[PDB]
C-alpha cells in the first residue's frame, strides 16, 4: 500500500491534521494505513477511523440521493443516458468505499477485538457499511440480512457487557432504529427500539461520567428527534 | 484524456449535474474535457468551468491554511517532519490544480477570446490562479507579477469595453483589489481601487439589468465590506 512505507504514529499524527483540515479522504487513506500495520487499534484510534470514512460515504450518499432524485424524476421529457450514466458513476464510488471499508473490518478488525468495546464498534460499523450498501442496492435482500446480522451479534454484546448510558451502545441502537425503519420496512421494530432505548438509559443517566455525557445525551436527542418524527 | 470518449455536450450536461450534487472535482473534470473538445465555451460554459476550479482549489487553500497555521505555531514542542510533510502534501496538490486551470487558459480558451466579456473573464481567472499560487510560494515575486500582468491586462479592457456595472468587471476589481492588499503590500493601492470601483458603479446603477442586478450588488457589497474593514 501506499502508506507502508510511513511509521505508524506518523499515520496517526497525519490523520488527526487531515482531521482539523476536513480533508476527510486523506484521512481515511491515513487510518486504513494504521489499520494495515497489522496492530489493533485504541479507542481514540477507532473514532479517527469511523470520522473517516463516515464523512467520505456520507459526501457520496448525498451526491447520489441528489442524482437519483433527478432520475426518478426524468423517468414520470427524455434527455439521453447521462443521469443515469453519472448516478452509477458515484454509485460505483461508493460501493467501492464501502467494500473497503468492509473489508478492513473483516481482514484485520473484527477478528482481533475482544473487549466488548472494540467488537461492538466495528460490528456497529459492519452493519453501517452494509447499510449504506443497502441503500443504493436493487441482492439488495442478502445485502440487507448481512447489515441486520451484524447489527443484532453487536446488540447482544452490547447489551451484555455495556451499560445503557454508554455512546457506542446508544449510536448502535440508534443505527439499527433507522435500519429498522428505513431499510427494512419494519417501522414498527424501529420505534420499539428507539423507544425502549431511550428510556433505558434515563434511569441509568445516574451514573452516566461526566465525561461521556454530552456524547449520550446527543445520541439520545437523536433518538427523541426519530421518535417524533415517526409517530 | 480520460472524458475524451464522452460528447461535448454530455461533457456539459454532467458538469451541470455534478454541480447540483456539489461534487466539484468531477465538475472540473468534466468542463476540462468540454474545454478540451477545442471549442469556445459560451458564458454559461465559462461559469461552469470557473465554478468547478473555484471550489476545488477553494477547499485546498482553506486545508493548507489550516496546516500552515498548525507548522507556523509548532516553530515559535518538536514532534518530527508530518506537519510540514502534510502541508507539503496539500500545497503540492493545490499547485498541480493551478498549474492545470492556468494550462488549459493558455492552450485553449485565452488565445481564441475576441469578445471583452470571454477575455476578461479569462485574463481574471489567470491573475485569480496565479494569485493562489502566490498565496503559498516562498519565485514568489515572478509568480506575483504573472498575476499582477494578467489582472492589469483585464482592467484595461474591462474599463475600455464594458460598463462599471458590469459583474465580470466588478469582480475582476474585487479580486484585484485583494492581490493589492494580501498578495503585493499595497493597502493604499487596494483601497483606491475598491473605493474608485463602488463609486462608479454607483453612478451607473441606473442602467443595470434586471438580470444582472443580484451579481452585481453582492460584489458592490462585497467590495463595501473589504472597505469597511480595511479602513
Ligand atoms: C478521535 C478524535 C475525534 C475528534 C475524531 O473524535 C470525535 C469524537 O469521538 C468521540 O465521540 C464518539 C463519536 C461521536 C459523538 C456523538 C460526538 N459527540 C459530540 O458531538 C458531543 C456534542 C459534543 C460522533 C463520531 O462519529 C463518533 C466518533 C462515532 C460514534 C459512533 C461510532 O460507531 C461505530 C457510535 C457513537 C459514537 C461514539 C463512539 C462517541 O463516543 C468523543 O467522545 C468525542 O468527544 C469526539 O467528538
Ligand atoms: C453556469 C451555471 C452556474 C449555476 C454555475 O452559474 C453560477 C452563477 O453564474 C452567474 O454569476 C456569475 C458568478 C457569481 C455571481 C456573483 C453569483 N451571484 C449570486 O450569488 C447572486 C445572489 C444571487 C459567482 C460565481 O462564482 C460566478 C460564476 C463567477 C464570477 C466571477 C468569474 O471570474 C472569472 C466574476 C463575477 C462573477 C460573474 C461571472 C457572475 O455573473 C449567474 O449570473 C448567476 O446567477 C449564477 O449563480
Ligand atoms: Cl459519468
Ligand atoms: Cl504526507
Ligand atoms: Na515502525
Ligand atoms: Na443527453
Ligand atoms: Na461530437
Ligand atoms: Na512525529
Known sequence: ????????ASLIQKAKLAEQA??????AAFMKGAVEKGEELSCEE??????AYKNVVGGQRAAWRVLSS????????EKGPEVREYREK???????VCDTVLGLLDSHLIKEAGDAESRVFYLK???????????????????????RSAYQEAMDISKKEMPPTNPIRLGLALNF????????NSPEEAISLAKTTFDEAMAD??????????????????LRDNLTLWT
Open 1 to 8: 500500500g501506499a502508506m507502508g512505507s510511513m511509521e505508524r
Open 22 to 27: 476536513e480533508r476527510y479522504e486523506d484521512m
Open 46 to 51: 477507532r473514532n479517527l477511523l469511523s470520522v
Open 70 to 77: 433527478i432520475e426518478q424524476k426524468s423517468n414520470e421529457e
Open 90 to 96: 458515484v454509485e460505483t464510488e461508493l460501493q467501492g
Open 125 to 147: 460499523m459492519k452493519g453501517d457499511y452494509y447499510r449504506y450498501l443497502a441503500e443504493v442496492a436493487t441482492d439488495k435482500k442478502r445485502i440487507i440480512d448481512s447489515a
Open 177 to 184: 432504529s433507522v435500519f429498522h425503519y428505513e431499510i427494512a
Open 205 to 222: 443517566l445516574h451514573t452516566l461520567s461526566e465525561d461521556s455525557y454530552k456524547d449520550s445525551t446527543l445520541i439520545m436527542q437523536l
